[PDB]
Amino acid sequence: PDMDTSFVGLTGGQIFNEMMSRQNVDTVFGYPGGAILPVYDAIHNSDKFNFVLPKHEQGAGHMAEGYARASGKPGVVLVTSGPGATNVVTPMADAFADGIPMVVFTGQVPTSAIGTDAFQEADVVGISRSCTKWNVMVKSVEELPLRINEAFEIATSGRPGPVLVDLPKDVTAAILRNPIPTKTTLPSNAQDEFVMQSINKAADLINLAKKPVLYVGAGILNHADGPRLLKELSDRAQIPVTTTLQGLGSFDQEDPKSLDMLGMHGCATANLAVQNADLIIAVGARFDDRVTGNISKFAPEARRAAAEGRGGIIHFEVSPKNINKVVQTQIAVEGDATTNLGKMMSKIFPVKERSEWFAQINKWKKEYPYAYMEETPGSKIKPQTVIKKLSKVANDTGRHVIVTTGVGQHQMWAAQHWTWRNPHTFITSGGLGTMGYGLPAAIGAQVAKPESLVIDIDGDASFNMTLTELSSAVQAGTPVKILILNNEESHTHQLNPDFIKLAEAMGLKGLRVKKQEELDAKLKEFVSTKGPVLLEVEVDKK
Amino acid sequence: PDMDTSFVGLTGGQIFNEMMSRQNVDTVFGYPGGAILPVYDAIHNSDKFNFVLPKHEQGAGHMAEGYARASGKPGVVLVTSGPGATNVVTPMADAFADGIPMVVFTGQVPTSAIGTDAFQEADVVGISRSCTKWNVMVKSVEELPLRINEAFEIATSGRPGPVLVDLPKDVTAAILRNPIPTKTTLPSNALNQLTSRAQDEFVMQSINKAADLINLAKKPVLYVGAGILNHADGPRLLKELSDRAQIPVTTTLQGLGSFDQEDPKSLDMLGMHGCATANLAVQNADLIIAVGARFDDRVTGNISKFAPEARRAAAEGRGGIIHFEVSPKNINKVVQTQIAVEGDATTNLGKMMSKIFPVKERSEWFAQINKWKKEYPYAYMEETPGSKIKPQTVIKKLSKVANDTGRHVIVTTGVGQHQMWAAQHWTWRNPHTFITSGGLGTMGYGLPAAIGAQVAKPESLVIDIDGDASFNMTLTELSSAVQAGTPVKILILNNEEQGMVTQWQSLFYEHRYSHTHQLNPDFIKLAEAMGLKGLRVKKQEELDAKLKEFVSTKGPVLLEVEVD
Ligand SMILES: Cc1cc2nc3c(=O)[nH]c(=O)nc-3n(C[C@H](O)[C@H](O)[C@H](O)COP(=O)(O)OP(=O)(O)OC[C@H]3O[C@@H](n4cnc5c(N)ncnc54)[C@H](O)[C@@H]3O)c2cc1C
Ligand SMILES: Cc1cc2nc3c(=O)[nH]c(=O)nc-3n(C[C@H](O)[C@H](O)[C@H](O)COP(=O)(O)OP(=O)(O)OC[C@H]3O[C@@H](n4cnc5c(N)ncnc54)[C@H](O)[C@@H]3O)c2cc1C
Ligand SMILES: Cc1ncc(C[n+]2csc(CCOP(=O)(O)OP(=O)(O)O)c2C)c(N)n1
Ligand SMILES: Cc1ncc(C[n+]2csc(CCOP(=O)(O)OP(=O)(O)O)c2C)c(N)n1
Ligand SMILES: [K+]
Ligand SMILES: [K+]
Ligand SMILES: [Mg+2]
Ligand SMILES: [Mg+2]
């Protein structure tokens, strides 16, 4: 019943700006073209928004993902019709796989032209249907606030993900002539006591456990307070904490209770603790088979405790669909994990010590460290050594440090051998494995966190996918530190450019390490450099 | 021979390899990954195929397009699951809009994993459904020859276009244990066929008309598009007909090269960015014989206002529009036509020829066309002492320098103002030599399309007339060019000091105010980093010598010209 006149007389472009403001957006990634011009002009022209221009729309999409991962905010993308929109399909699929909030706005031909094979009429809502949580084509300027608010709500709730909103040029150019319902303009906005019952039962089961383990994944990062309540629970009940690859950083790996990463490529200690726990407390993690291995062989002591009525598996999971999908759980706590951890906390018995359990874990840490063939006199440099050394150099700067990667062996070496300390600092394409992610993601993370040291630990073939964005980093004023672990040089051979001459052509400093004795000094020079810088290290082949 | 035992004992990967040979494929564009590995290893290790690697799968897709456009053969793409597949969506949408035959093979997670949200399981048949003529997920190795034969037949018939064949890793790794029907392993048939009395009579009747409707003559105009280029003999029979009945020829952007622009009866290009004489010779038409063209907006307008002098001869039942079109769906979809001739345009021309009454000359019209031209040339502000270089001037000089070599020349472009300047100011003579993204307008097309065209036509001089913003989209494929050895000639018309976005402009179009500037790399240092020669023109006095060196240079080379 309640009508709002406050947008009447505005174009859809100005209405778009105001809705961005209401959604607390101040950063947009994208690339102009005719169909999106009414919105692009409004956003370009307003000093309230930092518009970040890549050389390719794929770059905008991965920048938006890096921005979202680093800030906790949705990444907003603005591109034109036709090839502007089809060029952001890979980053939508990437955000869809990794549960990253992203709102994609695509210019479209006028509503009258739809279904006429017009120039750059793509069926973008058809194309993106399977790689978005939801998408829509806006049909009138009256509907623009509604759809925008709908889009942000969906992108950032449940398991976060990408949404796409298709914007016909006649709709965004139009002037709003009619009042619209006030609700549509305002950012939106028995099951309960089943959830409270499950919180109570989870607390009971945790209070009972002698050898619990917290198994933590990306979902803990989807609330600002997740890492803090995770740490509070781990201290309160003296529970060791292992993370998935996408949970790295959610728990300080220097904490005595850290087990580090679980899984096929994880810490043996993390895996042994999980195999021996009487209780697994799974928080925002999906039981991927790279983490569990053969699921029938997974957590036998927890399964035995369940069979005996004294432990098992608790799962804090926001999507009903993901509950009891892979493993049968004794207790599922449905909903946002941070929220539910906070409701549970007062019911947890404070435990002074678990001396035997931590003595066993620490014995394991001694018996089974990560191992790899280290350098010898005259040998080529090992990428694992670069990463270990760089982790220390970076940490010693005293700065907040964010790490992105490409896709390949270096991605796993980064996960394993970096020392993770802070949340929202490991930004890697895990669910889709998109080569080329590392550089634009670092540029977006740097925009999100302009004071942070932002390092891309990249591989040569990955880096080649999207290296045109080097000039974008210079233009955006993002002094990203690009590390190329170059293990190249029948089989497949790719010709690399000269990366140092490339970086200089693009407007940034370029450095190279060829032998062991140069590495320490060059790594220090690399992180100390004021602007953007590319360091190539020639490493051994696997 | 009912069953075919010849693949029994082979892996799907080896079957794929044999099926490429049966389809006469000798070039594949693609990029490795775990899911496509059984197929990748089978062809990347074969002396039968030239396997061309990009740095990004989008590059493979646009290379395959340039290859197809230059060769008349399907462009074959091979990429992995997940991001490999999503990375070729823009090239498929591009091929789909421009009717380019392309066969895309994507590796997929195993059939048992489909619908478990496995690592890199994308719904690629779903994603690619609106930008392919057809697609399919192969479900067993038995089915693999079948789907490959269907994909090539569909991609190359009717109006050509892209198809996608999704390849689960367990299917291509599997070994074929049982015989499969011979019908499913033998490639199909374009024509090479038989037709009924009924089919013959149907076509021959629409053909006898039009043939009569033309022999009537008057002020006719061949309006010719990409379709004339989709049969080896299209241009020849176009020329033959132009001569016979002495008819002037205008082309779309996508028909450029189908008619020699030197021939006295060439009207050159029409539409929004076409020349006055062509538009005049049409609109005020009479009888326009549309040959493999689709009356896009930028060509027509301006509907009702379109060809009225033809939309008269129709009322007066003395003219109108004849449409040689291969897809009945596109007939009367944009412009209501008086006679439709369904089918391949070239084949129908052939049939219609003899029935065509030779003509003396028509200089009541000719000398009138030859009047439009003088009174209305392509005009732009031409450089004066010390003034900036004009892009149109560069393109005209370059045309002449290329022509001076006596070589076959293929031109690709990026998208933007330079694309239209290339179309307008180059002098087009030979078929399949202008390769540009017209229907979708994909920035970044120029360089990988040139690389693929160069592979198709190794003896051709291949020039990419590119824009600076376009070129930045895909410039990583410079190293691909060096690796492939393709001696492409990359021209960057750098006008970076104008914005990419017009904010407003003076009424009499004299002045444009723009914003949104992109920071370019040093293109010459970049070319050298990527392993090729780089050249730069800053001033008028250098232009001639550099264009000559650019074109003369052995190997790939990048020339940047700073323009107004
Ligand atoms: C060859 C290979 C080897 C690998 N090796 C390893 C390895 O050794 N270790 C490892 O960890 N990974 C490894 N991976 C990565 C692994 O496959 C998964 O991508 C990763 O473990 C998934 O991490 P996740 O469960 O934290 O995140 P996600 O898949 O994002 O799942 C997070 C879960 O949290 C839920 N959720 C989201 N938000 C909330 C919320 N607010 N509240 C509650 N729940 C929420 C989601 O619905 C989801 O169920 C490997 C991958 C490959 C290809
Ligand atoms: C910035 C920009 C400006 C543009 N301005 C212009 C312009 O000014 N002038 C211009 O001409 N274009 C212009 N366009 C290009 C325009 O968008 C179209 O791409 C173009 O006009 C299409 O030409 P076409 O009809 O020949 O080709 P197509 O789009 O390929 O259509 C060909 C038609 O022929 C049919 N056909 C195909 N094969 C056969 C066959 N074997 N036998 C019979 N029929 C067949 C097809 O089914 C189809 O209907 C512009 C593009 C851009 C990006
Ligand atoms: C866009 C895309 N194409 C292909 C793949 C398959 N793939 C995964 S890793 C890899 C090689 C990675 O090379 P590099 O970046 O140099 O990392 P390295 O393994 O050497 O550390 C490929 C081709 C992919 N994940 N993404
Ligand atoms: C992939 C993609 N993004 C955006 C557009 C919209 N667009 C069309 S022309 C143009 C600018 C072209 O710049 P340039 O390549 O330098 O050509 P110029 O007009 O300067 O000659 C843009 C952004 C597009 N066609 N394709
Ligand atoms: K670590
Ligand atoms: K011309
Ligand atoms: Mg490598
Ligand atoms: Mg330009």
PDB file of N, CA, C and O in Angstrom, chain B residues 12-28:
ATOM      1  N   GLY B  12      38.808 -44.456 -26.712  1.00  0.00           N
ATOM      2  CA  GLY B  12      38.039 -43.343 -27.250  1.00  0.00           C
ATOM      3  C   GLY B  12      38.970 -42.270 -27.833  1.00  0.00           C
ATOM      4  O   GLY B  12      38.671 -41.631 -28.833  1.00  0.00           O
ATOM      5  N   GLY B  13      40.105 -42.060 -27.189  1.00  0.00           N
ATOM      6  CA  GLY B  13      41.094 -41.117 -27.678  1.00  0.00           C
ATOM      7  C   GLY B  13      41.624 -41.510 -29.037  1.00  0.00           C
ATOM      8  O   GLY B  13      41.741 -40.684 -29.924  1.00  0.00           O
ATOM      9  N   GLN B  14      41.939 -42.779 -29.228  1.00  0.00           N
ATOM     10  CA  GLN B  14      42.399 -43.203 -30.539  1.00  0.00           C
ATOM     11  C   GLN B  14      41.286 -43.175 -31.595  1.00  0.00           C
ATOM     12  O   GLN B  14      41.535 -42.979 -32.806  1.00  0.00           O
ATOM     13  N   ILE B  15      40.054 -43.408 -31.151  1.00  0.00           N
ATOM     14  CA  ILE B  15      38.912 -43.339 -32.067  1.00  0.00           C
ATOM     15  C   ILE B  15      38.733 -41.894 -32.514  1.00  0.00           C
ATOM     16  O   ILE B  15      38.513 -41.590 -33.690  1.00  0.00           O
ATOM     17  N   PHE B  16      38.871 -40.974 -31.581  1.00  0.00           N
ATOM     18  CA  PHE B  16      38.765 -39.563 -31.885  1.00  0.00           C
ATOM     19  C   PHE B  16      39.758 -39.164 -33.004  1.00  0.00           C
ATOM     20  O   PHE B  16      39.440 -38.476 -33.989  1.00  0.00           O
ATOM     21  N   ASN B  17      40.977 -39.607 -32.821  1.00  0.00           N
ATOM     22  CA  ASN B  17      42.066 -39.381 -33.757  1.00  0.00           C
ATOM     23  C   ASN B  17      41.683 -39.925 -35.158  1.00  0.00           C
ATOM     24  O   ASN B  17      41.742 -39.200 -36.166  1.00  0.00           O
ATOM     25  N   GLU B  18      41.239 -41.180 -35.235  1.00  0.00           N
ATOM     26  CA  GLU B  18      40.790 -41.717 -36.517  1.00  0.00           C
ATOM     27  C   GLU B  18      39.619 -40.934 -37.092  1.00  0.00           C
ATOM     28  O   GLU B  18      39.526 -40.750 -38.307  1.00  0.00           O
ATOM     29  N   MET B  19      38.684 -40.509 -36.234  1.00  0.00           N
ATOM     30  CA  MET B  19      37.535 -39.799 -36.737  1.00  0.00           C
ATOM     31  C   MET B  19      37.962 -38.424 -37.280  1.00  0.00           C
ATOM     32  O   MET B  19      37.372 -37.976 -38.231  1.00  0.00           O
ATOM     33  N   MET B  20      38.975 -37.755 -36.699  1.00  0.00           N
ATOM     34  CA  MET B  20      39.435 -36.481 -37.288  1.00  0.00           C
ATOM     35  C   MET B  20      39.945 -36.680 -38.717  1.00  0.00           C
ATOM     36  O   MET B  20      39.638 -35.891 -39.603  1.00  0.00           O
ATOM     37  N   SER B  21      40.722 -37.734 -38.931  1.00  0.00           N
ATOM     38  CA  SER B  21      41.167 -38.097 -40.280  1.00  0.00           C
ATOM     39  C   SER B  21      40.016 -38.343 -41.241  1.00  0.00           C
ATOM     40  O   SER B  21      40.017 -37.838 -42.342  1.00  0.00           O
ATOM     41  N   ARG B  22      39.048 -39.160 -40.843  1.00  0.00           N
ATOM     42  CA  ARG B  22      37.839 -39.367 -41.678  1.00  0.00           C
ATOM     43  C   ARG B  22      37.082 -38.062 -41.972  1.00  0.00           C
ATOM     44  O   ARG B  22      36.404 -37.946 -43.003  1.00  0.00           O
ATOM     45  N   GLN B  23      37.178 -37.078 -41.078  1.00  0.00           N
ATOM     46  CA  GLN B  23      36.579 -35.786 -41.391  1.00  0.00           C
ATOM     47  C   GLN B  23      37.544 -34.819 -42.114  1.00  0.00           C
ATOM     48  O   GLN B  23      37.276 -33.607 -42.177  1.00  0.00           O
ATOM     49  N   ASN B  24      38.705 -35.303 -42.545  1.00  0.00           N
ATOM     50  CA  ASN B  24      39.692 -34.456 -43.236  1.00  0.00           C
ATOM     51  C   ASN B  24      40.189 -33.269 -42.430  1.00  0.00           C
ATOM     52  O   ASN B  24      40.492 -32.216 -42.984  1.00  0.00           O
ATOM     53  N   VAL B  25      40.266 -33.444 -41.123  1.00  0.00           N
ATOM     54  CA  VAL B  25      40.842 -32.441 -40.249  1.00  0.00           C
ATOM     55  C   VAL B  25      42.359 -32.551 -40.288  1.00  0.00           C
ATOM     56  O   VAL B  25      42.892 -33.637 -40.113  1.00  0.00           O
ATOM     57  N   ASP B  26      43.087 -31.460 -40.498  1.00  0.00           N
ATOM     58  CA  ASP B  26      44.524 -31.579 -40.263  1.00  0.00           C
ATOM     59  C   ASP B  26      45.085 -30.585 -39.232  1.00  0.00           C
ATOM     60  O   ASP B  26      46.304 -30.551 -39.030  1.00  0.00           O
ATOM     61  N   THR B  27      44.204 -29.782 -38.615  1.00  0.00           N
ATOM     62  CA  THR B  27      44.568 -28.723 -37.674  1.00  0.00           C
ATOM     63  C   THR B  27      43.608 -28.728 -36.524  1.00  0.00           C
ATOM     64  O   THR B  27      42.379 -28.689 -36.727  1.00  0.00           O
ATOM     65  N   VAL B  28      44.148 -28.703 -35.301  1.00  0.00           N
ATOM     66  CA  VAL B  28      43.264 -28.576 -34.150  1.00  0.00           C
ATOM     67  C   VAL B  28      43.814 -27.479 -33.230  1.00  0.00           C
ATOM     68  O   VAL B  28      45.003 -27.407 -33.076  1.00  0.00           O
TER      69      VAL B  28
END
